Ligand binder design. Structure first.
Ligand SMILES: Cc1cc2nc3c(=O)[nH]c(=O)nc-3n(C[C@H](O)[C@H](O)[C@H](O)COP(=O)(O)OP(=O)(O)OC[C@H]3O[C@@H](n4cnc5c(N)ncnc54)[C@H](O)[C@@H]3O)c2cc1C
Ligand SMILES: Cc1cc2nc3c(=O)[nH]c(=O)nc-3n(C[C@H](O)[C@H](O)[C@H](O)COP(=O)(O)OP(=O)(O)OC[C@H]3O[C@@H](n4cnc5c(N)ncnc54)[C@H](O)[C@@H]3O)c2cc1C
Ligand SMILES: Cc1cc2nc3c(=O)[nH]c(=O)nc-3n(C[C@H](O)[C@H](O)C(O)COP(=O)(O)O)c2cc1C
Ligand SMILES: Cc1cc2nc3c(=O)[nH]c(=O)nc-3n(C[C@H](O)[C@H](O)C(O)COP(=O)(O)O)c2cc1C
Ligand SMILES: Nc1ncnc2c1ncn2[C@@H]1O[C@H](COP(=O)(O)OP(=O)(O)OP(=O)(O)O)[C@@H](O)[C@H]1O
Ligand SMILES: Nc1ncnc2c1ncn2[C@@H]1O[C@H](COP(=O)(O)OP(=O)(O)OP(=O)(O)O)[C@@H](O)[C@H]1O
Ligand SMILES: [Cl-]
Ligand SMILES: [Cl-]
Ligand SMILES: [Fe+3]
Ligand SMILES: [Fe+3]
Lengths: 374, 484, 484, 374
């Protein structure tokens, strides 16, 4: 347990460690404070990322960048990130028009997504039932990675670069002098610091409360769920397949051979985990509509995790001005794993230069009180 | 008579084909048993190339008429049947009933029957059993049993005999878990391929214990039989594990008594290091490097309560007497409205578990306003001290670790040992790094062992190493069965 | 260095004679240990012609300077000493102190010391120990110990270190029992050959457990070592049981760890059938008839509370966890004013027994009006689940029964088995017909086994076979010492 | 459990079984009722008998006869009765005169006891300290036997001859019609009988109470004690040696090799067993005065048992007239084992002929109320 640290990042999930990682390789001294183990929490319950098919400039630029960092660090640290694509199945003119429009904006900013044909979609993913799919949105540079593998990797490098990662260490309060942060109070003593980063997404409020932040930054934990099937021949389902029409289903195959996935089925603001029978039924219905072979496959286990939701499904990433050297990177609303490498870069630059290459202001912490939802 | 028949079978003779070869089987027999009778042990290979049978941990996927990936144990033999081996991951490519009931008893051993007998005096119960017969572990024995001073299988017949029309029996039926809806509990159940939803006011988990798995070198290879499977083939079907049989483990006498009854020759190897053989076992080696020639090894190292249904039902655990148990209030409740009875609670004689089921059924009968006397069962139960189990010192240094298998899937003892050696002691993490307890048993036959290894390498006491909880479907269900 | 020395002894060298032969020994050494060091094992013969050593059950009467019938274990070696073997029944032909004390603690292991440490804050205690050193079983180990994370023998030194002048220590002192005079208890005690009468207000039995005796063929022959004796010679004296050593029993690891520490070569025989040899052991045979050449066999099959002092003190027994225990009220009392603490209560780590002694001392301190806090020891104790012991299935059919010895005196397993076979199941009668539990141990090393045999041949449960109680002098005393 | 029996003997100790034994070999049908096992009770705690050196005609004649039956049955049933003698050590003229007088009466009735010399006494029993012994009373036809061995022997023969011996069977009451016994009520049903024998010495009162016997037959249980030493060379101490002067000590060697014995030390009317420290001390003092070598001998165990005492140390053996067919043979006051074979004979004859060869009237049940103590 250190007793002084230039920067203290709270939370040691993909986001927390990825931020530390950038700060540390940039020469800065960072210690992360995680109340359980590195990568417990949502990162531990997470799907397999990673996507550039978003619907607005900022997110598309951030994810384009993010994917570059996934390629770089993936091979540079040896942790495995397969670019198998993302496949959005479309079923009507409503959807086609909308995606034609999404792809257009994706393209402008260097994400070369194509609108594709049913039979093309079925070449990729031969087991896809193609009978009512009319087009599909396809990008071959989206991919999947194991959130735990990737976090642990970034973790050991961050340490190598000199970051302190503190594991069974919970933040409980702050020593705030004037509007200066002076220390982060924990269950194992106080650490002196002037700069802190809140990366606890689902718990963000708690950390905000302890800090006395009076700005409304609504981030609620919601229960989302996933299923895993028995393992299957390698490369049977390579890309992440999305079906908005069939219940916001997403499914793909794991590196073990599993076929993992969930659906939209959200359960109101709660910290409760524990899977539900209703999810079990619904996921089975949706998946087997999208790929019929799944009918013959054993379900092994089901689990749950938090989406840390904001009103506009975008994170709050920025400096909080009224507390001196408080930052927030939280509320990733279900897609925070894929963003992490890029938000690491952004937060580092904020701390370090006062501004960022990427359009970080889209994720303005102040947008909500100002009434400006994205 | 086939070579491993213990009796001449008088069922309707039938003919099947294994890898092209013509074999004789009888109607009603399950695939792996018909193949055993015909001296065939090796039924599948794991994804990393390990040969496997049907009588220890792990699934048995087989091509059964050009349909890949069917489970051998679940398939009844049928005339003209074309059976072939396949990869582990080879799959095939191509009207919900609602029943409302007072209690829903999960598990049909002496505890379950016990509960049902007590309960049907006034209430309507579902007796759920995945097993196809209604005894418990008891139906695996046929040796005189204490408590009911009477033959094991004769007692079962008597007890089943006494069931009302107030008891709906669900044979060959897998409960997927328990879901509290406040006003009732939902116990979704799978039989054949129909899904049935049982809505009940009360539930009892009469769920049983499972046989512990011994850690020695090729413990997964064909011709190794876990206690329960050896007893099943001998006593339920009447087929020998092999012509000459090695027996090991601390409850080896239970097995030896059956062997002696059937006149099956055997050796008693108190401490097994290794089993060897091409397709099947043909030698076992002890810790002093003595070899014995045999056709099969049977291990019996004690049963431990199956904790999965307990923790998915939302119960909490306690370590005592060498095993994990449910934490119960003073009324055998895991949680309001969910009772636990039998070898799910603790290890003790069949008769005791029978009483505990009656006890549990009586409490709920009292809950319902009927005048029952749970305490007469209470005081009968105290006459039975629950059994202990020795905690195994796995001689890790003395084993070739990559040969000794911890879980069903991939997962050698070496893989687990490696991660522990690199500092990781949290089973949550071990589960993820190695795939321990992520296979088609859900840790049933390996979690506790994984814990024992951590504990052994760490010094950390077992009563402090908490166990990853069981989740949504406590039993494998596929997936088509769950739409719409 | 003598052949079986583990260290070079730096005590005053001395010279003794065995059967005429000139041997070297060191001052302070006890007779059988000096003879062991010099590779001499066979020290006496029983009345029916059975050769015997000093390291298992039974007495060792020897002619020590023309004086017949002295006990070998009790005799310190002395320069010029003339030692000879003799018959079992060969005998020689040719100022009471009163001390008043608050408590009188019988037994000087961690429990006893624990009690004394607690008590001497305010009270005057007698710490009585027959053993000559003040550790317990703990002083036999020298391996790091849980609880006090520190070397076994280093802890003892620390603890003894902390004893007041409020504690009178009585080394080499045998308590003859406890006698309630209402207004006080009389604990008569023998040291050297003086009788001392200790009158105390309270007593605590910190009396210990004894090592169980294993039933196999020549289990009494010279060169068989019970766990405690093997550890004593190795760790207290520094002498090996033999050059190459067989080890058996369910607590064999405790022993193996000591062997490894001292670098004494050994084999681990999980299941011993027989030991053979002329004067000493030279082979052991297992249940599968494998032979091993060795100089000694060490067995360690678990300790069980010594129940004698308990029942003579007027306490009652309970069967639980594979062994007989004292029935205690909620304050660790056998009876008003007599407390029980340590491995006398139950089997558990040294540290736990240490706490229990403090606990027991605190209760009596509270009784006396001092402000003590027994409950902090209480809650520390709960962190330790008491250990179980497997009940042995003696393979009676597989043994040659007249070779396997049940008690010290005559008494083969055959003699006992015979009477049981003729219908007698009451141990009272068995005791009388055979001489089981009438020898110079008072059943300490055989009663429980006798019970196990009845239970095994009868089917009658052990929790129902009640045990003949310990009587007047719980330890052998001769007889002159008790006049006038 | 029989339901009718001509004769019911209550108590299955040496006396009870020995009586059954005579009745059964005489052709009569007898069942004994013992609440524990045959020979538990005092017989189980008993010394090794057997003596003809008494001080009055009746006892001397009875014991002379008794010893004849010991010789006969001993070899006839193979149970072992060594005639090693009894040795009364004398220390003063007081004692000598008294024993001169006792021996005289012994002789008249065919018990050939001799007054002997110190050195003679020391030939027998070489380890005797002879220094203050002035004479000894010696009879070579007294002996010792194992009370348990002997009882079990008589027991199996009684069964062979047709007696029923009922073991875990306690008498609790009597069915008495007029003054006729009709049945003996037990913990396992009632047995019909017209003739019952009370042979429960220490418990005699209890049985008398249940029978409603109004005659005062005072029999009280007293605690006597014994010691056993470690085994010693065979034939070291052969006869029973008695020393009145040293605390009514008696000691001899068992067949196992033990050296067993007790002293006078009596503890007031009680049913308590459990040995005492005070006995431990006293026996050690007395024994080691009489034979000094005992000083080097280990004491192994100590135990206790009942003397069933009457005011004149003689049993009550007779018909009780006011209950129809009630008999008593109880209160042997420490020497009932040696008498048993003879009292068996006497009681049988009473039941069977109405009178006895031996002088049974000395043991008159009515003597106590009549004021006539022996
Ligand atoms: C079922 C499921 C599937 C998902 N699939 C995807 C996907 O495919 N792609 C994708 O991009 N995202 C996905 N997500 C979301 C993704 O998991 C999250 O966006 C991501 O994990 C956010 O990372 P984080 O580090 O911000 O949060 P976390 O991983 O939760 O890290 C926050 C950490 O802060 C710690 N903490 C909290 N309070 C304290 C305190 N007081 N002191 C110290 N530490 C504290 C917690 O212990 C926790 O480890 C999925 C989520 C779920 C639930
Ligand atoms: C230490 C000691 C040493 C002795 N040494 C000698 C000796 O050297 N020589 C000698 O001659 N005598 C000796 N005696 C005395 C001798 O033991 C007795 O005189 C003798 O045992 C009397 O035999 P019994 O059958 O009358 O009494 P017991 O042996 O007591 O038989 C009476 C039986 O009646 C049974 N009973 C009681 N109540 C009931 C009931 N309600 N229903 C059914 N059964 C019942 C009891 O269970 C008991 O077994 C000694 C006694 C003691 C204590
Ligand atoms: C990428 C990923 C893969 C997983 N794979 C499996 C799996 O193959 N088998 C399995 O049983 N569970 C699998 N799980 C579920 C884990 O057991 C998961 O950590 C979990 O269940 C959370 O713990 P809990 O259910 O005890 O709350 C997987 C989870 C994730 C995030
Ligand atoms: C003839 C006789 C011989 C005995 N010999 C021995 C003996 O050699 N060793 C021993 O320990 N006890 C011996 N005893 C004592 C027995 O243990 C005796 O039955 C007894 O102690 C009574 O049981 P209790 O002490 O449990 O009440 C002997 C008793 C008798 C009557
Ligand atoms: N999810 C489940 N669905 C249906 N049956 C189950 C399920 N889980 C366990 N069981 C069944 O419960 C039964 C447990 O009975 P078992 O005999 O093992 O224990 P018991 O009745 O407590 O008494 P004993 O252990 O002494 O036989 C087994 O037959 C097992 O197949
Ligand atoms: N009658 C007795 N007189 C004197 N000492 C006795 C007597 N009976 C037993 N003892 C002694 O009591 C001691 C018991 O200590 P022991 O170490 O076995 O148990 P403990 O103190 O409860 O703790 P642990 O069993 O963990 O060591 C032994 O040293 C034994 O010699
Ligand atoms: Cl999220
Ligand atoms: Cl008497
Ligand atoms: Fe598994
Ligand atoms: Fe003994």
């Amino acid at each position: 347990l250190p007793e002084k640290s230039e920067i203290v990042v709270i939370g040691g999930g993909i986001v927390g460690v990825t931020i530390a990682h950038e700060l540390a390789k940039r020469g800065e001294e960072v210690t992360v404070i995680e109340k359980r183990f590195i990568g417990s929490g949502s990162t531990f319950r997470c799907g397999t990322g990673i996507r550039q098919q978003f619907n607005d400039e900022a997110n598309v630029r951030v994810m384009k960048r993010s994917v570059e960092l996934w390629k770089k660090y993936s091979e540079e640290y040896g942790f495995s990130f397969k670019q198998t694509g993302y496949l959005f199945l479309l079923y009507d003119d409503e959807e086609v028009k909308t995606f034609k429009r999404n792809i257009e904006i994706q393209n402008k900013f260097g994400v070369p997504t194509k609108l594709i044909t049913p039979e093309e979609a079925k070449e990729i993913v031969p087991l896809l039932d193609i009978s009512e799919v009319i087009a599909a949105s396809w990008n071959p540079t989206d991919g999947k990675a194991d959130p735990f593998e990737a976090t642990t990797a970034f973790a050991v490098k961050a340490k190598e670069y000199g970051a302190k990662l503190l594991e069974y260490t919970e933040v409980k309060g702050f020593l705030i002098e004037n509007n200066e942060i002076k220390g982060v109070k924990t269950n194992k003593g106080i650490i002196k610091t002037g700069i802190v980063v809140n990366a606890t997404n689902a718990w963000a409020n708690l950390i905000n409360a302890m800090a006395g932040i009076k700005t409304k930054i609504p981030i609620e934990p919601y229960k989302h769920q996933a299923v895993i099937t028995q393992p299957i021949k390698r490369g049977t389902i390579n890309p992440m397949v999305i079906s908005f029409k069939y219940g916001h289903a997403y499914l793909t195959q794991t590196f073990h051979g599993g076929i993992i996935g969930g659906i939209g089925y959200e359960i109101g603001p709660t910290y409760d985990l524990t899977p539900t029978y209703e999810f079990l039924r619904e996921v089975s219905y949706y998946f087997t509509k999208i790929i019929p072979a799944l009918k013959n496959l054993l379900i092994l286990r089901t689990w749950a995790g938090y989406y840390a939701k904001t009103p506009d499904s975008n994170p709050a990433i920025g400096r909080i001005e009224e507390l001196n050297d408080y930052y927030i990177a939280a509320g990733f609303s279900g897609h925070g794993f894929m963003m992490a490498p890029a938000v690491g870069e952004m937060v580092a630059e904020l701390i370090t230069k006062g501004k960022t290459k990427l359009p970080v202001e889209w994720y303005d912490p102040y947008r909500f009180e100002r009434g400006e939802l994205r | 008579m086939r070579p491993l028949d213990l009796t001449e079978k008088r069922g309707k003779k039938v003919t099947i084909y294994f890898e092209g070869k013509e074999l004789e089987a009888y109607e009603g027999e399950k695939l792996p048993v018909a193949l055993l009778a015909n001296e065939i042990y090796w039924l599948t290979t794991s994804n990393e190339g390990r040969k496997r049978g049907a009588f220890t941990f792990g699934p048995v996927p087989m091509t059964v008429n050009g349909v890949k990936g069917l489970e051998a144990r679940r398939i009844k033999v049928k005339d003209g049947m074309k059976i072939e081996r396949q990869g582990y991951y080879d799959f095939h490519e191509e009207e919900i009933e609602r029943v409302v009931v007072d209690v829903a008893i999960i598990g049909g051993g002496p505890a379950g029957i016990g509960a049902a007998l007590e309960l049907q005096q006034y209430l309507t119960v579902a007796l759920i059993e995945e097993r196809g017969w209604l005894g418990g572990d008891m139906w695996l024995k046929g040796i005189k049993q204490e408590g009911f001073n009477k033959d094991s299988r004769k007692v079962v017949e008597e007890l089943v005999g006494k069931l009302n029309e107030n008891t709906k029996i669900y044979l060959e039926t897998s409960a997927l878990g328990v879901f509290d809806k406040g006003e009732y509990f939902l116990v979704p159940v799978v039989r054949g391929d129909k899904l049935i939803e049982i809505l009940a006011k009360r539930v009892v988990l009469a769920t049983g214990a499972i046989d512990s798995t011994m850690l020695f070198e090729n413990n997964d290879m064909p011709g190794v039989f876990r206690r329960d499977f050896a007893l099943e083939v001998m006593n339920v079907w009447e087929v020998a594990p092999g012509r000459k049989v090695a027996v090991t483990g601390s409850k080896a006498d239970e097995v030896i008594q059956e062997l002696e009854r059937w006149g099956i020759d055997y050796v008693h190897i108190p401490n097994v290091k290794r089993v060897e053989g091409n397709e099947k076992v043909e030698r076992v080696i002890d810790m002093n490097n003595h070899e014995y020639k045999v056709d099969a090894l049977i291990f019996a190292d004690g049963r431990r309560p199956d904790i999965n249904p307990i923790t998915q039902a939302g119960g909490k655990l306690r370590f005592r007497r060498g095993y994990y148990s449910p934490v119960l209030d003073e009324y055998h409740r895991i949680k309001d409205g969910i009772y636990v009875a039998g070898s799910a609670v603790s290890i003790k004689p069949h008769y005791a578990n029978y009483l505990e089921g009656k006890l549990v059924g009586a409490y709920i009968l009292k809950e319902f306003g009927y005048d029952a006397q749970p305490c007469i069962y209470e005081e009968k139960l105290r006459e039975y001290e629950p059994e202990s189990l020795s905690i195994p010192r796995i001689p890790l240094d003395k084993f070739n670790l990559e040969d000794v298998q911890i879980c069903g899937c991939d997962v050698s003892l070496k893989k687990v040992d490696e991660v522990i050696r690199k500092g990781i002691t949290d089973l949550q993490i071990i589960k993820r790094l190695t795939h321990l307890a992520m296979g088609f048993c859900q840790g049933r036959y390996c979690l506790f062992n994984g814990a024992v290894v951590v504990s052994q390498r760490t010094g950390k006491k077992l009563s402090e190493i908490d166990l990853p909880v069981a989740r949504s479907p406590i039993k494998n269900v596929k997936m088509g069965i769950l739409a719409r």
